[PDB]
Design a protein around this ligand. Structure first.
Ligand SMILES: O=c1ccn([C@@H]2O[C@H](COP(=O)(O)OP(=O)(O)O)[C@@H](O)[C@H]2O)c(=O)[nH]1
Ligand SMILES: CC1=C[C@@H]2O[C@@H]3[C@H](O)C[C@](C)([C@@]2(CO)[C@H](O)C1=O)[C@]31CO1
Length: 433
């Protein structure tokens, strides 16, 4: 038995689990009783097992808004029900050979360690961000992290790009803005020198200096991109689509800004007018509440070339031949999905890993551009238009496509039989089988 403990609510861990099963391990997804009550189980090859966060009949994420507070409930109950799961499973003849866990849950580690269960930390943020947090946790870097700090890592051949003030990860560049996430980001690495394995959802051709440093400093092994095999061309394992089928090749701007507060739906009006003014066909994901908040006049303007939808099969949209670029907040999973499909990016980072990923996208990978905010931090329609035309029509357009395609090929190769990430996956599985 391999146990998989992602933060409760995933895909990347489960995809790693699917490859463990291919090599003959038996994976179990471990999640809350709530998730398990409500959501359907992953199905074969997975079993599921349930712990508790204190909240078996209601989301405690809702019931406890503050960051610090939810975590303590989850820990208190989770640590205890996890301990019982392990002991139960052991007594049941199904002892856990290894616990793969999100190190945003460092108590997973102590529970497993206490029961003699090997631990494998699963980092699903890019090496470049993980390493900065690590350096802070090891006290080789002092809060706050500054562009100067970053330029030192760059000079030392650890970071492949020079990060400015809008590129450093804000959780440690501006700790005071978000102290709980700051702490948690850094703490992932306290006690990670004790893990039997450390795994990162990236690939080494993507971030070669950063992945080499993570490997030599934390023994981190790249196991990504951890996505469904189909999209990596690996054979060993709806209205918007009908709309995409009618579009010309490489023409559509996929757009996912993410969640917007009431404090700004002016933002969405800027975004939507920018889209209309670009003149490109566009598929814009806006959740239904937020759509009802758009102006009548913006909705009519969007009818001409756009389709607004509450959700889409993002990976399938990105693989469709109609899709020409992705205006994204540049979350990591989203970004790897774009890479693997060879889609240029227009990056609108908000937080967490996004600023740093966006800098990589623009300045090392060369697969798109990042939107420039004004003095007040606002994204204007003119900037949205400009970025779209820059990627889809400008003089550098073929550079963005060529670079994305280059990264798509190395992504696929890394995960195919015999690639760098596939080898790390196979070594990990031979270790526990
Ligand atoms: O309409 C949507 C919005 C998101 N996702 C998926 O949800 C995951 C994470 O979404 P988010 O947009 O927060 O991006 P991340 O921040 O994880 O990169 C990714 O695998 C997306 O493919 C999707 O399939 N359809
Ligand atoms: C309670 C809680 C929710 C968080 O949301 C943001 C993001 O959506 C994922 C997470 C990593 C996040 C979930 O992992 C964080 O770890 C956390 O502790 C977070 C800090 O970056």
């Amino acid at each position: 038995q391999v146990l998989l403990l992602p933060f409760p609510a995933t895909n990347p861990m489960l995809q790693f689990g699917r490859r463990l099963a291919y090599h003959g391990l038996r994976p179990t997804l471990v999640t809350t009783r709530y998730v398990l009550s409500t959501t359907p189980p992953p199905g074969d090859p997975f079993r599921v097992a349930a712990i508790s966060d204190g909240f078996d009949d209601a989301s405690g994420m809702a019931a406890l808004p503050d960051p610090g507070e939810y975590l303590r409930t989850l820990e208190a109950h989770g640590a205890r029900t996890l301990a019982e799961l392990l002991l139960s499973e052991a007594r049941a003849g199904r002892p856990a050979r290894v616990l793969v866990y999100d190190p945003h849950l460092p108590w997973a580690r102590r529970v497993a360690r206490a029961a003699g269960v090997a631990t494998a930390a699963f980092l699903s943020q890019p090496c470049a961000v993980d390493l900065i947090y690590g350096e802070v946790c090891a006290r080789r870097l002092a809060l706050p992290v500054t562009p100067t700090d970053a330029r030192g890592l760059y000079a030392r051949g650890v970071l492949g790009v020079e990060l400015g003030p809008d590129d450093v990860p804000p959780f440690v560049a501006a700790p005071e803005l978000t102290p709980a996430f700051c702490e948690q980001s850094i703490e992932q690495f306290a006690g990670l020198e004790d893990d039997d394995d450390v795994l990162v959802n990236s690939f080494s051709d993507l971030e070669p200096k950063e992945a080499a440093y993570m490997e030599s400093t934390w023994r981190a092994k790249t196991i990504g991109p951890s996505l469904p095999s189909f999209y990596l061309d690996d054979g060993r394992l709806v209205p918007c689509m009908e709309w995409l089928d009618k579009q010309p090749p490489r023409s559509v701007v996929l757009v996912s800004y993410g969640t917007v507060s009431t404090f700004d739906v002016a933002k969405l009006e800027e975004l939507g007018n920018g889209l209309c003014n670009s003149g490109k066909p566009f598929l814009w994901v806006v959740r239904s509440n937020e759509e009802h908040k758009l102006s009548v006049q913006l909705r009519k303007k969007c009818e001409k070339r756009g389709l607004i939808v509450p959700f889409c099969p993002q990976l399938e949209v990105l693989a469709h031949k109609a899709t020409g670029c992705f205006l994204s907040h540049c979350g990591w999973n989203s970004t790897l999905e774009a890479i693997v499909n060879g889609v240029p990016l227009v990056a609108m980072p908000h937080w967490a890993d996004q600023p740093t990923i966006s800098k990589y996208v623009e300045s090392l990978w060369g697969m798109g551009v990042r939107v420039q905010l004004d003095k007040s931090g606002i994204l204007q329609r003119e900037e949205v238009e400009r970025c779209i035309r820059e990627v889809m029509d400008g003089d550098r357009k073929e550079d963005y496509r060529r670079n994305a395609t280059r990264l798509m090929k190395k992504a696929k190769e890394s995960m195919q039989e015999g690639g760098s990430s596939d080898k790390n996956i196979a070594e990990f599985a031979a270790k526990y089988s």
